[PDB]
Amino acid sequence: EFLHAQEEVKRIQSIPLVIGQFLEAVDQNTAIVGSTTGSNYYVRILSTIDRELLKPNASVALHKHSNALVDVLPPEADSSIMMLTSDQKPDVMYADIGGMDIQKQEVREAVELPLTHFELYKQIGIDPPRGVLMYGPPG
Amino acid sequence: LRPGRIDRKIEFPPPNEEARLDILKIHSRKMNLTRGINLRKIAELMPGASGAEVKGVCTEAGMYALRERRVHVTQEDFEMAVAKVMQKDSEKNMSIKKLWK
Amino acid sequence: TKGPDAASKLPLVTPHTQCRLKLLKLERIKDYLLMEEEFIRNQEQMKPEEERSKVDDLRGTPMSVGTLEEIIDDNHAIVSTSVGSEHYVSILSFVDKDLLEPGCSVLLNHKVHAVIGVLMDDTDPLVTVMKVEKAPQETYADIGGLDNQIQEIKESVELPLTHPEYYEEMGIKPPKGVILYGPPGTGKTLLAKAVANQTSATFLRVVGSELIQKYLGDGPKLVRELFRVAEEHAPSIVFIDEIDAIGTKRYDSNSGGEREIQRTMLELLNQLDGFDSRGDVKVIMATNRIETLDPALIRPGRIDRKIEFPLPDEKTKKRIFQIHTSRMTLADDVTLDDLIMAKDDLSGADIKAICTEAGLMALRERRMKVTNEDFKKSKENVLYKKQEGTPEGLYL
Amino acid sequence: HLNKPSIQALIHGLNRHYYSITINYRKNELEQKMLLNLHKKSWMEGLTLQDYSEHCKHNES
Amino acid sequence: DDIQQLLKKINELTGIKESDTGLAPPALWDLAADKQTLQSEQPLQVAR
Amino acid sequence: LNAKVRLLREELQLLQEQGSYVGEVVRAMDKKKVLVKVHPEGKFVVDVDKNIDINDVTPNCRVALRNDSYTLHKILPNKVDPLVSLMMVEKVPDSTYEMIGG
Ligand SMILES: Nc1ncnc2c1ncn2[C@@H]1O[C@H](COP(=O)(O)OP(=O)(O)OP(=O)(O)O)[C@@H](O)[C@H]1O
Numbered sequence: 001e002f003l004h005a006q007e008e009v010k011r012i013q014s015i016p017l018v019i020g021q022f023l024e025a026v027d028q029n030t031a032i033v034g035s036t037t038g039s040n041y042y043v044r045i046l047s048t049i050d051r052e053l054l055k056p057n058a059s060v061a062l063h064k065h066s067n068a069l070v071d072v073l074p075p076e077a078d079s080s081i082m083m084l085t086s087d088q089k090p091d092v093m094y095a096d097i098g099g100m101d102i103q104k105q106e107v108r109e110a111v112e113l114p115l116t117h118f119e120l121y122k123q124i125g126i127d128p129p130r131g132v133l134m135y136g137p138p139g
Numbered sequence: 140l141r142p143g144r145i146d147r148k149i150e151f152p153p154p155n156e157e158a159r160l161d162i163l164k165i166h167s168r169k170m171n172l173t174r175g176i177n178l179r180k181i182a183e184l185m186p187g188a189s190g191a192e193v194k195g196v197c198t199e200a201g202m203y204a205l206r207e208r209r210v211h212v213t214q215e216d217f218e219m220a221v222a223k224v225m226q227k228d229s230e231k232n233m234s235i236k237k238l239w240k
Numbered sequence: 241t242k243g244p245d246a247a248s249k250l251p252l253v254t255p256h257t258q259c260r261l262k263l264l265k266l267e268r269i270k271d272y273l274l275m276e277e278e279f280i281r282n283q284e285q286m287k288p289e290e291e292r293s294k295v296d297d298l299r300g301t302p303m304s305v306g307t308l309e310e311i312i313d314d315n316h317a318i319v320s321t322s323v324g325s326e327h328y329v330s331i332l333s334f335v336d337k338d339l340l341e342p343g344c345s346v347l348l349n350h351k352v353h354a355v356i357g358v359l360m361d362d363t364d365p366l367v368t369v370m371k372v373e374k375a376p377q378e379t380y381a382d383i384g385g386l387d388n389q390i391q392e393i394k395e396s397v398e399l400p401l402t403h404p405e406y407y408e409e410m411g412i413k414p415p416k417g418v419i420l421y422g423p424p425g426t427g428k429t430l431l432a433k434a435v436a437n438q439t440s441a442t443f444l445r446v447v448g449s450e451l452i453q454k455y456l457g458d459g460p461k462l463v464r465e466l467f468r469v470a471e472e473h474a475p476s477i478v479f480i481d482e483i484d485a486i487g488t489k490r491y492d493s494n495s496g497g498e499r500e501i502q503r504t505m506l507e508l509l510n511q512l513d514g515f516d517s518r519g520d521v522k523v524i525m526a527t528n529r530i531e532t533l534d535p536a537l538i539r540p541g542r543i544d545r546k547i548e549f550p551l552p553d554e555k556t557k558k559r560i561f562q563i564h565t566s567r568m569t570l571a572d573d574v575t576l577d578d579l580i581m582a583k584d585d586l587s588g589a590d591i592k593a594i595c596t597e598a599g600l601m602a603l604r605e606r607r608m609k610v611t612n613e614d615f616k617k618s619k620e621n622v623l624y625k626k627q628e629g630t631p632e633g634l635y636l
Numbered sequence: 637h638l639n640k641p642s643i644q645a646l647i648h649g650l651n652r653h654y655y656s657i658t659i660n661y662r663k664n665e666l667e668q669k670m671l672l673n674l675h676k677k678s679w680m681e682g683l684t685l686q687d688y689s690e691h692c693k694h695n696e697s
Numbered sequence: 698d699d700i701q702q703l704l705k706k707i708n709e710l711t712g713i714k715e716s717d718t719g720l721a722p723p724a725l726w727d728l729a730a731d732k733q734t735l736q737s738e739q740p741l742q743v744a745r
Numbered sequence: 746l747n748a749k750v751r752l753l754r755e756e757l758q759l760l761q762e763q764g765s766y767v768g769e770v771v772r773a774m775d776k777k778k779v780l781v782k783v784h785p786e787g788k789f790v791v792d793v794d795k796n797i798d799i800n801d802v803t804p805n806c807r808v809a810l811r812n813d814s815y816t817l818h819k820i821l822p823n824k825v826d827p828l829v830s831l832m833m834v835e836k837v838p839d840s841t842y843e844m845i846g847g
């Protein structure tokens with residue numbers, strides 16, 4: 001009976017499903033997510049759903065009929081403000097650019113090196129520089 | 140800015156020598172300072188250093204050791220880092236500079 | 241006319257030295273409040289049906305709210321569903337066909353749409369919140385000086401309601417609409433909170449920014465509803481603080497957002513002096529800048545008295561000090577005249593801030609009795625934001 | 637038993653104009669057995685070795 | 698503070714004031730025929 | 746195991762009840778009648794469940810109405826705008842007074 005109950009519990013995540021935004025949490029196993037249909041509903045929450053992905057903007061998935069929070073969908077922020085996708089690489093090698101050895105090293109030392117070798121930064125006691133300003137004559 | 144809305148209007152002036160030395164000591168607590176690095180002298184080399192510029196000086200002193208693959212910063216690593224962070228832009232024109240006697 | 245829904249203020253106790261008689265008066269008020277609570281609770285408990293029950297079964301649950309648009313027959317009507325559609329509904333018997341008027345909010349049966357009630361007092365909750373229910377605790381005795389200014393505001397919003405015979409026996413229409421203008425921190429909003437503490441009429445309050453909305457039709461409609469509520473509630477006072485937000489000088493704006501600003505202003509103008517005369521509703525407007533308001537908004541006929549609040553004079557500043565130091569514990573050496581005589585442009589808010597700061601410097605030195613030095617210090621630690629801007633020694 | 641008058645149907649009229657009747661389904665042998673063939677696998681199923689490459693990948697994961 | 702709390706609770710005990718929904722006097726009531734009007738007549742959508 | 750399977754079955758039964766609407770309370774209207782404002786629809790003078798004291802139904806609340814009978818059955822936390830809600834600090838910073846000199 002327990003595997004049966006788990007099976008129908010999984011079945012409630014069948015794939016007629018509307019999506020709504022997780023506005024706010026009331027208490028355990030319930031929510032106030034508003035559906036994309038145009039209305040906000042006071043709903044119930046699956047136990048299987050982990051509550052830590054229920055950030056108060058999540059585009060959670062709702063049951064079509066009972067209109068209950070049945071699934072939390074991963075956020076959609078792939079290219080909101082033109083974040084460089086895998087097909088939008090500039091295709092400019094470091095060796096392609098000529099000279100600029102000091103300028104390359106300073107830039108590489110604040111925006112590329114800290115991401116990879118953070119341990120070496122932390123080993124001295126300095127937080128890596130967060131902003132660089134390249135300036136000079138045009139071109 | 141009328142009182143009843145803003146009762147206290149607290150000013151944050153640029154830190155003095157005894158204050159800049161303090162900023163140099165809280166932003167270098169985690170830094171592996173050597174022996175003989177007089178933090179007061181570096182503070183004395185920064186007249187009117189805002190307060191974030193002291194942290195920038197500490198960070199650049201550490202950076203001057205990062206490019207050399209070390210963990211300790213010497214006095215010269217700070218003195219050569221003060222001139223970098225505490226850089227100034229001059230008028231670069233005597234004709235404009237002598238507009239006023 | 242539902243009558244003036246005046247704010248509920250408890251009786252004041254006026255010993256302020258924390259003596260026993262203060263406790264006696266507060267305990268008297270407490271005993272009466274306890275007796276009123278006993279009355280209501282014991283009325284509910286002591287208190288232990290066929291006619292209205294049939295009506296409630298007929299109406300059912302829920303019960304929609306629509307807008308009446310046409311009374312076709314004595315038993316038939318056309319209403320607009322709250323989405324914007326129309327329906328040829330039937331009028332039921334328990335519905336009173338006199339209150340059924342075009343434009344009013346009618347109750348509709350959910351399953352079979354039909355008029356089953358009239359929803360009077362359907363005021364927008366953005367306007368029902370505008371009404372003051374708990375009166376401010378700042379009486380006219382809490383203001384030092386401004387006797388001329390207080391008298392001007394007292395002859396237009398209180399005297400015409402206590403002694404209308406004086407106005408009617410002479411032939412006047414009492415001043416209806418005053419504007420309170422001056423430097424910041426002089427006592428305009430204080431005067432508004434003071435009249436709200438003494439008036440017996442409903443006191444709607446607005447910052448001149450609640451009545452501005454993103455929607456096209458909501459802006460002017462909200463001011464129309466506010467004035468409709470003010471007229472509905474008998475004598476009324478509408479305090480539009482910071483009127484400079486909406487009522488600025490008109491101009492040919494190339495922005496649609498600003499063109500609605502002038503459009504709701506032009507309805508504030510209409511609701512003040514238009515084709516249909518206003519009711520017994522006074523309007524009190526406040527602004528820090530009278531030179532920026534539209535000439536039509538501050539035009540006589542709409543605003544009759546332009547009460548000016550200049551920076552407090554020496555005597556006015558001395559009275560303001562005593563008003564703000566009444567609850568203090570001043571030392572015997574505290575001669576306030578040292579601070580008043582200074583030519584600095586000290587507003588009343590400046591005086592209150594000096595008093596608070598002077599009290600705080602006493603806590604700095606572990607004292608609950610402020611001395612004269614505390615005041616001389618608080619004057620300097622509080623007199624910022626104005627520095628010293630004046631012409632140099634040109635003039636002799 | 638077997639039901640509680642639903643709210644979704646009570647407001648449209650229950651025990652007032654029409655009343656529900658308890659539902660019971662006559663299912664007997666020689667009918668269920670034919671129905672179990674919807675997802676019954678076969679003799680081949682149960683002896684297949686899956687795929688060893690993805691089996692190793694899944695085991696490692 | 699007791700005065701303030703007492704004022705809060707006493708205004709809570711009676712704040713909800715009756716808002717009548719415009720019912721006609723009982724003399725002009727035809728509930729028996731009103732039910733007939735409710736069941737027989739149907740809501741007609743206004744169209745052009 | 747019986748407790749676990751019981752919990753699963755009660756969750757399954759409770760999940761099939763339709764989601765309840767949320768609406769702002771304009772004002773109370775009797776002792777058993779509350780005026781509400783469903784978001785897509787308009788006003789509604791709804792009933793109140795026996796488990797809710799009407800004195801707790803203040804104007805501008807966010808009570809929940811049942812899916813079909815439109816019956817008030819919960820007060821629900823008050824509505825704040827989603828953009829004005831992120832302005833409240835939920836994770837305090839890691840800067841202390843000891844890190845400020847001068
Ligand atoms: N004549 C006065 N007597 C007593 N207190 C005064 C007087 N004038 C001003 N104050 C004090 O000034 C404080 C500032 O509030 P107030 O209502 O006076 O501001 P305001 O002049 O309306 O401000 P704004 O121009 O910013 O709208 C009040 O709390 C009040 O105590």
Ligand SMILES: [Mg+2]
Nearest residue numbers: 428429481526
């Ligand atoms: Mg003011």
